[PDB]
Write an enzyme that holds these catalytic residues in place. Structure first.
Site, PDB file in Angstrom:
ATOM      1  N   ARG A  42     -14.803  -6.798 -12.785  1.00  0.00           N
ATOM      2  CA  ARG A  42     -14.273  -5.752 -12.986  1.00  0.00           C
ATOM      3  C   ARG A  42     -13.397  -5.654 -14.441  1.00  0.00           C
ATOM      4  O   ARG A  42     -12.274  -5.560 -14.502  1.00  0.00           O
ATOM      5  CB  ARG A  42     -13.329  -5.205 -11.668  1.00  0.00           C
ATOM      6  CG  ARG A  42     -13.824  -5.211 -10.604  1.00  0.00           C
ATOM      7  CD  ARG A  42     -13.062  -5.175  -9.469  1.00  0.00           C
ATOM      8  NE  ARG A  42     -13.498  -5.301  -8.138  1.00  0.00           N
ATOM      9  CZ  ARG A  42     -12.982  -5.605  -6.897  1.00  0.00           C
ATOM     10  NH1 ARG A  42     -11.694  -5.882  -7.009  1.00  0.00           N
ATOM     11  NH2 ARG A  42     -13.524  -5.499  -5.598  1.00  0.00           N
ATOM     12  N   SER A  61     -11.881  -5.043   2.467  1.00  0.00           N
ATOM     13  CA  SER A  61     -11.842  -5.372   1.157  1.00  0.00           C
ATOM     14  C   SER A  61     -13.180  -6.197   0.557  1.00  0.00           C
ATOM     15  O   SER A  61     -14.226  -6.603   1.230  1.00  0.00           O
ATOM     16  CB  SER A  61     -10.664  -5.922   0.614  1.00  0.00           C
ATOM     17  OG  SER A  61     -10.594  -7.370   1.118  1.00  0.00           O
ATOM     18  N   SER A  62     -13.058  -6.750  -0.642  1.00  0.00           N
ATOM     19  CA  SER A  62     -14.102  -7.625  -1.221  1.00  0.00           C
ATOM     20  C   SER A  62     -13.218  -9.037  -0.845  1.00  0.00           C
ATOM     21  O   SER A  62     -12.360  -9.286  -0.392  1.00  0.00           O
ATOM     22  CB  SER A  62     -14.273  -7.338  -2.485  1.00  0.00           C
ATOM     23  OG  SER A  62     -13.222  -7.841  -3.304  1.00  0.00           O
ATOM     24  N   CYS A  90      -0.628  -7.979  -1.382  1.00  0.00           N
ATOM     25  CA  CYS A  90      -0.651  -6.801  -0.364  1.00  0.00           C
ATOM     26  C   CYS A  90       0.212  -6.733   0.881  1.00  0.00           C
ATOM     27  O   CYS A  90       0.571  -5.804   1.194  1.00  0.00           O
ATOM     28  CB  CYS A  90      -2.207  -6.713  -0.030  1.00  0.00           C
ATOM     29  SG  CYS A  90      -3.341  -6.348  -1.137  1.00  0.00           S
ATOM     30  N   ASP A 146      -1.899   5.777  -3.369  1.00  0.00           N
ATOM     31  CA  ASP A 146      -1.452   4.405  -2.605  1.00  0.00           C
ATOM     32  C   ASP A 146      -0.507   3.728  -3.602  1.00  0.00           C
ATOM     33  O   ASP A 146      -0.802   3.700  -4.873  1.00  0.00           O
ATOM     34  CB  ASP A 146      -2.674   3.576  -2.131  1.00  0.00           C
ATOM     35  CG  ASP A 146      -3.277   4.190  -0.857  1.00  0.00           C
ATOM     36  OD1 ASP A 146      -3.038   5.101  -0.434  1.00  0.00           O
ATOM     37  OD2 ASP A 146      -4.240   3.322  -0.362  1.00  0.00           O
ATOM     38  N   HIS A 154      -6.688   0.322  -4.942  1.00  0.00           N
ATOM     39  CA  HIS A 154      -5.703  -0.674  -5.473  1.00  0.00           C
ATOM     40  C   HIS A 154      -6.171  -1.562  -6.661  1.00  0.00           C
ATOM     41  O   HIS A 154      -7.421  -1.560  -6.819  1.00  0.00           O
ATOM     42  CB  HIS A 154      -5.512  -1.422  -4.228  1.00  0.00           C
ATOM     43  CG  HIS A 154      -4.949  -0.719  -2.954  1.00  0.00           C
ATOM     44  ND1 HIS A 154      -5.086  -1.210  -1.526  1.00  0.00           N
ATOM     45  CD2 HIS A 154      -4.616   0.659  -2.655  1.00  0.00           C
ATOM     46  CE1 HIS A 154      -4.993  -0.341  -0.821  1.00  0.00           C
ATOM     47  NE2 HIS A 154      -4.469   0.786  -1.451  1.00  0.00           N
ATOM     48  N   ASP A 165       0.851  -1.262   0.039  1.00  0.00           N
ATOM     49  CA  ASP A 165       0.181   0.218  -0.018  1.00  0.00           C
ATOM     50  C   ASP A 165       0.750   1.303  -0.189  1.00  0.00           C
ATOM     51  O   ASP A 165       0.312   2.246  -0.683  1.00  0.00           O
ATOM     52  CB  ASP A 165      -1.003   0.215   1.100  1.00  0.00           C
ATOM     53  CG  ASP A 165      -2.131  -0.953   1.111  1.00  0.00           C
ATOM     54  OD1 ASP A 165      -2.166  -1.738   0.166  1.00  0.00           O
ATOM     55  OD2 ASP A 165      -3.125  -0.868   1.875  1.00  0.00           O
ATOM     56  N   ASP A 215      -4.360  -4.491  -7.423  1.00  0.00           N
ATOM     57  CA  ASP A 215      -3.930  -5.894  -7.478  1.00  0.00           C
ATOM     58  C   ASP A 215      -4.946  -7.043  -7.334  1.00  0.00           C
ATOM     59  O   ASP A 215      -4.638  -8.325  -7.054  1.00  0.00           O
ATOM     60  CB  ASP A 215      -2.589  -6.071  -6.752  1.00  0.00           C
ATOM     61  CG  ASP A 215      -2.876  -5.264  -5.331  1.00  0.00           C
ATOM     62  OD1 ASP A 215      -3.525  -4.492  -5.166  1.00  0.00           O
ATOM     63  OD2 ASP A 215      -1.761  -5.734  -4.615  1.00  0.00           O
TER      64      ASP A 215
HETATM   65  C1  LIG Z   1      -6.352  -5.565  -2.801  1.00  0.00           C
HETATM   66  C2  LIG Z   1      -7.891  -5.195  -2.447  1.00  0.00           C
HETATM   67  C3  LIG Z   1      -8.518  -4.589  -3.632  1.00  0.00           C
HETATM   68  C4  LIG Z   1     -10.159  -3.941  -3.669  1.00  0.00           C
HETATM   69  N1  LIG Z   1      -9.987  -3.047  -2.650  1.00  0.00           N
HETATM   70  C5  LIG Z   1     -11.098  -5.156  -3.271  1.00  0.00           C
HETATM   71  O1  LIG Z   1     -11.600  -4.753  -2.258  1.00  0.00           O
HETATM   72  O2  LIG Z   1     -11.152  -6.031  -4.130  1.00  0.00           O
END
Ligand SMILES: CCC[C@H](N)C(=O)O
Ligand SMILES: CCC[C@H](N)C(=O)O
Lengths: 360, 360
Positions: free
Chosen positions: B259, B291-292, B344, B191, B240, B107, B242
């Site tokens: 996405r 996150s997700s 991460c 970030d 982010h 990050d 990744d």
């Molecule tokens: C590395 C986490 C990426 C994103 N913020 C998510 O929640 O998928």
């Protein structure tokens, strides 16, 4: 009923397109040598078991993605095989080998009506090629299609003519005259691309990879609805029929000038139009590791009046245009290096039409 | 020359791994709310300023220690940030706040060649996050590495869209369509995790925490050796890149199915292989506060053929295995709660390789 295709020209609705990813140079065994032009032997000798030149694979990947975009533009639903690392070495009780690729759906899958048939193959490096297509096939199966896998050979030494005059000799023509090739009649074997469809009539050629046992299995499996006819051509190294006798419409066929059909009179008597395409203009310095220059006539018909043809092959484009066939030009110069044109790189799953006879 | 990394896949030799110790729930300010799923608002509302559940932190601590043992086993030198109590309340002339953690090196730190760059950040609770990494960075500096800190923002109110439709609205997609997020263009902020490396080409995404000013600072700071490209995806809450577009090898990328990239054709035209991973199997009852569920594709490559993947995510393991990539399975189910996967939780300091172009 996702699957339904009776010939090579009805309005295309769904197609499977191959992948160039992770393609590997096949080990240089007798059956590979039989197909390879002297010009490439050292390449095969040093590269066998390793990936095809990655810089080259990258250009082919791009070319096939564009072809896919164009197919979608033309209203065709496109399915792609699963990505697989073809370098994995596998071992059956009969042999050991690394894989090839899943670039050519036409080589392994053929659709006859509502049935998708997986060819057995004849190359040791292609034994497990069906693995890339199982996700697609299971989906069609769940949706009502018939699914058939022809008997997978052992591919033991007995299947190959270990003493075939591969080294150059040309009297391969003589053996060829006798229907004698690198594959014996030990067990059934065949590549689906040695069969070409015209409704109730399917034409097959005994080749380096398709034996009479393999053809008889197809004939017996499809009878009585379909009739499988054997035809031969002047060719010392046959492997697949679609760059020799490509049927482009009801009663219309592209016959390769260098490979005349011994049974051409059967078609002339049927009132069929035999068109001989002009010669390819592909440079001799461009690498065609797996085939001849004749990929130019390996066209794919979107329908009777629309043909997907190579952007670089202008002479054959003009030919189609004078015949009233709209040319959809796509460049696949680097994909050609892997061994195929538009017909080879695809497998028509669904074409809008009915089962008919075009031979009267 | 301890520092040297040009991409995400060359043979990993040294890495920094985060810490879960003393992590604190960040105060519930506008930019935190913009990232938080409705499901967790009450938690943030009541827990802000206090430590994340200690029983949970203890399990994450254990999981990361094992991951570290495994990295050492795989021949990777591991460095860890200094332990810090993140609950200390600090005050700048612009705001007052408590900290977050130093769990995610990705990050805040990015290595481009021989240079380690500390991102400025965009969250008030992360203003002083760099303090945990100074002992490591000074050591690399003493040993020859380049050290750069991008301009630290004031993080004054002007940086935030105080009236962003955080409360749920989804037309965040509309603003997102306009490249409009919770952060304004008041001053540069970003970030480091919004940038992903592929040699001479670095891809960046304008997100909730990375503005165009921040991207332009990176672009200008790295030119002419590196080219920073902006790419966007269908995502109403980006933070982010990744877990959206994770590049795993030269010309190979994992694209999150939910996405899609608006500029995917640029990569298809470059001959790149876009692989869409299967969906995560993580239970919906497990807390993912930051996150997700897509942390499953947030993998770390030890080299082109070795990937560190979650032990629990079998479907994606199978995917890699069919591609010939050896899977090193590690369980970090509880560490995931803090907001990250393998990519991460780490920062690759040194990978064995050279600067190259993979976009041709
Ligand atoms: C590395 C986490 C990426 C994103 N913020 C998510 O929640 O998928
Ligand atoms: C489709 C390829 C046909 C043949 N093997 C050739 O080289 O012409």
């Amino acid at each position: 009923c996702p699957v339904s295709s009776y010939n090579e020209w009805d309005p295309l609705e769904e197609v499977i397109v191959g992948r160039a990813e992770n393609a590997c140079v096949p080990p240089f065994t007798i059956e590979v040598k039989a197909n390879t032009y002297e010009k490439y032997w050292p390449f095969y000798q040093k590269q066998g078991g390793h990936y095809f030149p990655k810089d080259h694979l990258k250009k082919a990947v791009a070319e096939i993605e564009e072809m896919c975009n164009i197919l979608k533009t033309e209203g065709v639903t496109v399915r792609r095989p699963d990505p697989i690392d073809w370098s994995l070495k596998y071992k059956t009780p009969d042999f050991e080998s690394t894989g090839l690729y899943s670039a050519m759906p036409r080589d392994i899958l053929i659709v006859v009506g509502n049935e998708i048939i997986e060819a057995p193959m004849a190359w040791r490096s292609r034994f497990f090629e069906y693995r890339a297509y199982r996700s697609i096939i299971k989906d069609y199966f769940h949706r009502g299609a018939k699914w058939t896998t022809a008997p997978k050979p052992t591919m033991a030494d007995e299947l190959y003519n270990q003493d075939y005059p591969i080294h150059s000799v040309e009297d391969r023509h003589k053996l060829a005259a006798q229907g004698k090739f690198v594959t014996t009649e030990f067990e059934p074997c065949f590549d689906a691309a040695d069969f070409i469809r015209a409704g109730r009539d399917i034409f097959a050629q005994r080749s380096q990879v398709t034996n009479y046992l393999g053809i008889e299995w197809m004939r017996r499996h499809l009878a009585p609805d379909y009739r499988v006819h054997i035809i031969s051509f002047k060719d010392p190294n046959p492997m697949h029929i679609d760059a020799t006798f490509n049927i482009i419409g009801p009663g219309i066929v592209l016959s390769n000038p260098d490979r005349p059909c011994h049974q051409i009179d059967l078609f002339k008597k049927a009132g069929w139009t035999i068109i001989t395409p002009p010669t390819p203009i592909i440079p001799d310095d461009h690498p065609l590791w797996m085939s001849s220059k004749w990929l130019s006539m390996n066209v794919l018909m979107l329908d009777e009046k629309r043909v997907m043809v190579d952007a670089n092959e202008v002479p054959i484009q003009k030919m189609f245009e004078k015949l009233g066939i709209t040319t959809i030009k796509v460049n696949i110069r680097n994909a050609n290096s892997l061994g195929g044109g538009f017909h080879c790189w695809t497998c028509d799953v669904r074409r809008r039409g009915t089962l008919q006879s075009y031979l009267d």
